Design a protein around this ligand. Structure first.
Ligand SMILES: CCCCCCCCCCCCCCCCCC(=O)OC[C@H](COP(=O)([O-])OCC[N+](C)(C)C)OC(=O)CCCCCCCCCCCCCCCCC
Ligand SMILES: CCCCCCCCCCCCCCCCCC(=O)OC[C@H](COP(=O)([O-])OCC[N+](C)(C)C)OC(=O)CCCCCCCCCCCCCCCCC
Ligand SMILES: CCCCCCCCCCCCCCCCCC(=O)OC[C@H](COP(=O)([O-])OCC[N+](C)(C)C)OC(=O)CCCCCCCCCCCCCCCCC
Ligand SMILES: CCCCCCCCCCCCCCCCCC(=O)OC[C@H](COP(=O)(O)OCCN)OC(=O)CCCCCCCCCCCCCCCCC
Ligand SMILES: CCCCCCCCCCCCCCCCCC(=O)OC[C@H](COP(=O)(O)OCCN)OC(=O)CCCCCCCCCCCCCCCCC
Ligand SMILES: CCCCCCCCCCC1=C(C)C(=O)C(OC)=C(OC)C1=O
Ligand code: SF4
Ligand code: SF4
Ligand code: SF4
Lengths: 314, 43, 156, 176, 110
């Protein structure tokens, strides 16, 4: 019965990642004054199915890897960590209702850089390894502002419990007291997922260009699971919805609409901006977001004390 | 003779300059709105 | 028999999925690149057919040779074609890719890209229009639709 | 008679400095760009439904070649080799002889469509409107030599497309 | 226990999809490929700057590790000391950032 709950979590994750690709191609079509896919299915609804069947019977590139074992373990780790970030998500009830769900998510997203690192070293190209090291350095850079923005917000929560974050936002959204944290958080989640304007794995060859089309589709679907997940986590964190404990589907519809609009905001940002040069997003992290994030971390430490609004522990 | 020609008075005027219409609030008003949202959230 | 029916339905499935998700690697060699970009432009929009805009060469399904293949770039074309995973296809766009074209008698031009790679669709024009190139891509999809891989495998 | 792009010295009073700082911190031009992209989201796209909807053309359009005939069945080509003399890519190969009734007619009229640059110098060199570059652009092949047209293929293209070619020439011959 | 079941299910689904993605086109008998990089054969040049940003991540991440018990630390009854040491740790992270700044450590990956 619990395994039914695990499958009703993880199989709709795979379906929503399948159709996020279609939604991205359609929304980027209409924002680029064209259509998206509308031939393959009715309104293109069979485009992800056709494309998945195409990729799973495409020939393997059959490369020379330094490690066979890390070449197998990098997609396994990417998919496993992409699926374990969902299990504490309170929507309105988490699958695993853990007391440190925020810190668990922060740790399991910190572990996601080994997929990039192991897949880069598993490729024998030195250029793929250099691009992998640039992607890892970008990601661990933006993890700093993830951790500190998240800490500064949870100073208003009182605990690392994700389910308490619904109770925190019953009177107001937490984007009202923490909109600078919210906007730096949103750009930091944009830079965690190698998402445009921070997609330097498509700027002129990434880390996973040496895989077959099947494992490349697995990396791709882990990345889009991370995108949908970080939008849901941002929605829980700043745009927390109303919850009737006798009608949980009201909260589910509300956070689902907000998370869809936030994922479409990711799609709409990649359809609007040029890329950063690599040192420019290093400049954006280390010289712009991190001083503001430390200043607001001091502010959200000292502000519940000066207003007498320290939240409860329990 | 019949030939592709402009009409009797010629064509009407054609816009060719920049038109970036200067929308949005001032900097004072935008910082005031953001600080007011901060104060509402803190309260 | 029953196995004949199963390989017929499975060939129909895999051919549907391969033709309905063609990913092109376009060689922007010469003027035909501009008309490929018009076949990607919002009037014609290859992406509504599932034909994405600028897939990377290690994951592409068709190689659209759009422009003049000179002798100095013939091994680069061959190397990219060798790096493409199967089933790979090659569309020859325009007269210089087809038969050398206006530079057929040149000292420096490969007389048609078919001397270097096997070619599936020859799209004629100088340049062929973006509608004519889209016609050639739909004819390539019809060529993939009538492939008989599992049926010939079941008969071999 | 000239203008200076990007020669504005920005105002340094507290109003304009606070405006630029609000633009930097509150990302006003980024929301402007998002608004323009959102404005295209709700426009009707420009995508026609090929193959069912076709791109607009004109009677001057230079597509697939055709040999034409008179309104009696006699072919117009009288073997004068002006089209292959003017041909900038030498796509046209012509051999001729007098046929059984003594008319000056071709026995070889080849057009290599993979040398052809589709510029239509042949149809304007032609003094009898025999060769035309017709309206067809959807004639892609699966084989290279299916684009090496002989006289039979060009005459069949003329018989196939004459009802359209003659009306395009009727639309355009007064400009010629 | 439910967490171990969930981790095992996620790992098993990931390993299953990886095995399917690595062995479903192996059933095809496509062809044997011979196929005889921007760098030609040159050794990987070390860059000091990537190592500096990785160590700067590690040091600020240790400072983050110190900062992580603050939502529980605000519940204390020694609030003046807690607030002083909290502002002092964020200030030392800021001073580490300023020293990394002003000695050109944040340059060409700024
Ligand atoms: C979570 C829900 C959504 C959240 C909001 C996000 C939605 C909108 C997203 C739009 C698309 C963004 C795409 C990526 C853009 C990346 C570039 C970018 O913006 O860089 C950030 C830029 C970077 O600066 P820059 O690069 O533009 O400027 C040049 C920088 N120097 C000078 C160093 C060369 O700005 C920031 O870092 C600002 C971050 C937020 C700051 C918030 C400040 C709040 C107010 C503080 C007080 C001010 C008043 C004075 C004191 C008053 C005291 C009472
Ligand atoms: C859940 C997401 C989607 C999952 C994946 C999509 C579902 C369908 C997966 C199976 C697709 C069909 C079989 C693989 C593709 C066959 C294409 C091919 O190359 O066939 C020729 C290949 C090889 O045949 P061949 O002998 O002609 O080889 C061609 C290469 N030469 C001639 C040079 C040697 O056929 C096979 O591999 C047959 C294997 C069994 C076919 C399937 C059995 C039933 C499975 C259910
Ligand atoms: C530079 C250091 C700046 C901060 C110094 C300590 C500030 C503070 O709040 O101290 C009170 C705190 C706590 O005082 P308290 O008054 O909270 O103590 C009550 C006792 N307990 C906590 C058990 C309930 O520290 C001390 O009194 C002693 C430790 C710090 C002593 C000074 C260290 C100087 C190092 C120089 C090198
Ligand atoms: C949480 C919900 C998630 C939902 C996800 C999916 C959303 C979209 C679902 C699909 C919508 C309808 C798509 C219909 C496609 C067209 C099918 C069709 O008609 O194919 C015709 C083809 C040839 O037929 P033929 O007889 O030759 O035609 C000549 C007629 N004179 O015949 C064939 O090709 C053979 C028949 C193929 C039929 C395929 C139909 C679509 C399959 C979709 C599978 C997944 C559906 C969702 C599963 C979960 C919910 C139940
Ligand atoms: C190359 C190898 C393969 C790589 C791919 C697979 C591995 C990577 C992806 C999976 C990562 C596994 C993470 C396991 C622990 C996660 C942390 C954790 O347990 O947090 C949840 C929770 C803490 O919150 P709390 O509510 O306080 O505890 C319950 C008290 N009421 O604590 C609990 O609820 C406690 C539950 C019981 C304890 C669970 C212990 C799990 C088994 C040990 C680790 C197994 C994995 C080892 C390898 C990890 C990665 C290297
Ligand atoms: C368990 C398998 C589920 C289906 C596989 C993932 C969903 C299909 C995504 C297909 C896809 C699309 C549309 C796509 O556009 C794309 O290119 C950017 C991919 O990466 C190679 C893709 O993988
Ligand atoms: S076939 Fe002609 S128009 Fe096309 S790329 Fe070649 S030279 Fe340019
Ligand atoms: S269109 Fe030009 S290149 Fe083609 S056959 Fe006529 S004259 Fe020769
Ligand atoms: S097609 Fe015209 S120009 Fe060419 S040989 Fe015949 S009559 Fe002369």
């Amino acid at each position: 019965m619990f395994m039914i709950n695990v499958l009703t979590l993880i199989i709709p994750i795979l379906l929503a990642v399948a159709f996020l690709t279609l939604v991205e191609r359609k929304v980027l079509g209409y924002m680029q004054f064209r259509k998206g896919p509308n031939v393959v299915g009715p309104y293109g609804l069979l485009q992800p199915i056709a494309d998945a069947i195409k990729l799973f019977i495409k020939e393997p590139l059959r490369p020379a890897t330094s490690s066979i074992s890390m070449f197998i373990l990098a997609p396994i780790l990417a998919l496993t960590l992409a699926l374990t970030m969902w299990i504490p998500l309170p929507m309105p009830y988490p699958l695993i209702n853990m007391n440190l769900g925020v810190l668990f998510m922060l740790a399991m997203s910190s572990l996601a850089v080994y997929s990039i690192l192991w897949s880069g070293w598993a490729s024998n190209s030195k250029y793929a390894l250099i691009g992998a090291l640039r992607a890892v350095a970008q990601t661990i850079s933006y993890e700093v502002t993830l951790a500190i923005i998240l800490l500064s917000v949870l100073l208003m929560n009182g605990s690392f419990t994700l389910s308490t974050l619904i109770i925190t936002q019953e009177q107001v959204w937490l984007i009202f007291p923490a909109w600078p944290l919210a906007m730096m958080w949103f750009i930091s989640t944009l830079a965690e997922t190698n998402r445009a304007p921070f997609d330097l794995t498509e700027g002129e060859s990434g880390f996973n260009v040496e895989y077959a089309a099947g494992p490349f589709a697995l990396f791709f679907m882990a990345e889009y699971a991370n995108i949908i997940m970080m939008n849901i986590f941002t929605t829980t964190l700043f745009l927390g919805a109303f919850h009737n404990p006798y009608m949980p589907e009201l909260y589910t519809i509300n956070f689902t609409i907000k998370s869809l609009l936030l994922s479409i905001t990711f799609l709409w940002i990649r359809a609007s901006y040029p890329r950063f040069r690599y040192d420019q997003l290093m400049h954006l992290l280390w010289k712009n977001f991190l001083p503001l994030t430390l200043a607001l971390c001091m502010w959200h430490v000292s502000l519940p004390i000066l207003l007498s609004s320290i939240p409860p522990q329990t | 003779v019949k030939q592709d020609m402009p009409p009797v008075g010629g064509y009407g005027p054609i816009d060719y300059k920049r038109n970036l219409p200067r929308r949005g609030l001032s900097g004072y008003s935008m910082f005031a709105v953001g600080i007011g949202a901060l104060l509402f959230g803190y309260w | 028999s029953r196995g004949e029916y199963v390989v017929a339905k499975l060939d129909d499935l895999i051919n549907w999925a391969r033709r309905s998700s063609l990913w092109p690697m376009t060689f922007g060699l010469a003027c035909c690149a501009v008309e490929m970009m018009h076949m990607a432009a919002p009037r014609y929009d290859m992406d509504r057919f599932g034909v994405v805009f600028r897939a990377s060469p290690r994951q592409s399904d068709v190689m659209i040779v759009a422009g003049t293949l000179t002798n100095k770039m013939a091994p680069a074309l061959r190397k990219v074609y060798d790096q493409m995973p199967e089933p790979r296809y090659v569309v020859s766009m325009g007269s210089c890719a087809n038969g050398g074209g206006y530079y057929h008698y040149s000292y420096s031009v490969v007389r048609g890209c078919d001397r270097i790679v096997p070619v599936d669709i020859y799209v004629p024009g100088c340049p062929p229009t973006a509608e004519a190139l889209l016609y050639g891509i739909l004819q390539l999809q019809k060529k993939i639709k009538r492939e008989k891989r599992l049926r010939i495998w079941y008969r071999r | 008679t000239y203008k200076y792009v990007n020669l504005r010295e920005p105002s340094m009073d507290m109003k304009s400095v606070t405006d630029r700082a609000a633009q930097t911190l509150l990302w006003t031009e980024l929301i402007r760009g998002l608004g323009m992209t959102l404005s295209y989201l709700f426009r009707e796209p420009a995508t026609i439904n090929y193959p069912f909807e076709k791109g607009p053309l004109s009677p001057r359009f230079r597509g697939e070649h055709a040999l034409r005939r008179y309104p009696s069945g006699e072919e117009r080509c009288i073997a004068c080799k002006l089209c292959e003399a003017v041909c900038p890519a030498q796509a046209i190969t012509i051999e001729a002889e007098p046929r059984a009734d003594g008319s000056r007619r071709t026995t070889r009229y080849d057009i290599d469509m993979t040398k052809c640059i589709y510029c239509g110098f042949c149809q304007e060199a032609c003094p009898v409107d025999a060769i035309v570059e017709g309206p067809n652009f959807e004639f892609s092949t699966e084989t290279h030599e299916e684009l090496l047209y002989n006289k039979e293929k060009l005459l069949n293209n003329g018989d196939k497309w004459e009802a359209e070619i003659a009306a395009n020439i009727q639309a355009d011959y007064l400009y010629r | 226990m439910n967490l171990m079941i969930t981790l095992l299910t996620n790992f098993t689904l990931a390993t299953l999809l990886v095995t399917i993605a690595f062995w479903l086109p192996q059933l095809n008998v496509y062809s044997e490929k011979t196929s005889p990089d921007p760098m030609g054969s040159a050794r990987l040049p070390f860059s000091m700057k990537f190592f500096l940003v990785a160590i700067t991540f590690l040091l600020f991440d240790l400072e983050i590790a110190l900062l992580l018990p603050l939502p529980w630390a605000s519940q204390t009854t020694n609030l003046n000391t807690m607030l002083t040491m909290a502002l002092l740790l964020i200030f030392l992270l800021a001073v580490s950032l300023a020293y990394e700044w002003t000695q050109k450590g944040l340059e060409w990956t700024e």
